[PDB]
Amino acid sequence: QTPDREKALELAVAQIEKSYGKGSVMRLGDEARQPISVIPTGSIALDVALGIGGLPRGRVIEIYGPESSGKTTVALHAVANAQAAGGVAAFIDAEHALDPDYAKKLGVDTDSLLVSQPDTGEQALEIADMLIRSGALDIVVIDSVAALVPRAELEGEMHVGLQARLMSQALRKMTGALNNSGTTAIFINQLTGGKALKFYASVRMDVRRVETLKDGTNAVGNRTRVKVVKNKCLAPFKQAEFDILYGKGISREGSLIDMGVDQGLIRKSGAWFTYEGEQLGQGKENARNFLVENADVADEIEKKIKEKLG
Length: 310
Ligand SMILES: Nc1ncnc2c1ncn2[C@@H]1O[C@H](COP(=O)(O)OP(=O)(O)O)[C@@H](O)[C@H]1O
Ligand code: ALF
Known about the structure:
By secondary structure, the protein is an alpha/beta fold. The protein is built from 11 helices and 14 strands. The protein has 2 domains: 26-250, P-loop containing nucleotide triphosphate hydrolases (Rossmann fold, 3-Layer(aba) Sandwich); 251-310, RecA protein, C-terminal domain (Rec A Protein, domain 2, 2-Layer Sandwich). The protein has a 9-stranded mixed sheet, sandwiched between helices. Strand 12 (266-267) and strand 13 form a beta hairpin. Helix 5 runs parallel beside helix 7. It is globular and about 65 Å long. 40% of the residues are buried. The structure holds adenosine-5'-diphosphate and tetrafluoroaluminate ion. Residues 68-73, 99, 102, 221-222, 244, 246-247 line the site of adenosine-5'-diphosphate. It is classed as hydrolase. Keywords: recombination, DNA-repair, Structural Genomics, PSI, Protein Structure Initiative, TB Structural Genomics Consortium, tbsgc, hydrolase. It forms a monomeric assembly.
């Protein structure tokens, strides 16, 4: 007995998907799904590494990694895009360390940015809940899961396992509104909420800095590598690398060439980087430079790789 198995299995998956959701069972090869709702990340690589071409709306994402790696950047980038399309964002601050200049440089209309700075972890998630429940916000981001210390541990009365309780609680309740409003919550994790977020979260991102981007002088950026460890929206375990310039953020340009060569649209005749005959430049950075100053052609590449995938 051979094929009827594949038909019994097709039903199996249908059965499951029915009671546990679209992404309850997947094949790592499935090119499946693709909505109209997606916040680009800033890098075409991470975009397609998400499969869905951006972040998924009405869902909670968790981006975790080591101090100084990419996260917040990625986040603020997700903030800057969910902004460029007239949506509005809130930044629930718990570390007190956002640098507006850098945000502005990435593109956050810092002025419209709903920022808040709670004095207890609990209060922190709630502000996020009602802010969410209004259906006004498109993207909301809670900076750091680890800094959300409980009122109790804050009042002095220290048991423990306060965090994992408060989180789960909030997450359970908070997971509902989200899918019912279309706001995507982004949680910066560090490295403790663990379990809770781990499961409610529909997309988990592992960000870590790979190499300290050498550029003649000292250092222009970092070549980050995000590893989407969980993806209830598209075949997980996919990943992406990209440069993050010091002060400039993710080089959408730098992403374009790399993808451009890994997809045949850009040819690298040894040192030179070609595109549809026209010579781009000599040296990834010289081409990055060329693209940024030549946006018209820049989104041309970005356009032609989209057609060939998402
Ligand atoms: N104001 C800034 N000027 C230059 N580079 C910055 C600045 N803020 C962040 N970065 C870059 O981002 C890296 C850390 O990213 P950031 O968003 O602060 O945090 P994370 O990536 O950990 O979420 C730094 O190593 C640096 O490359
Ligand atoms: F540089 Al970070 F979390 F902002 F490690």
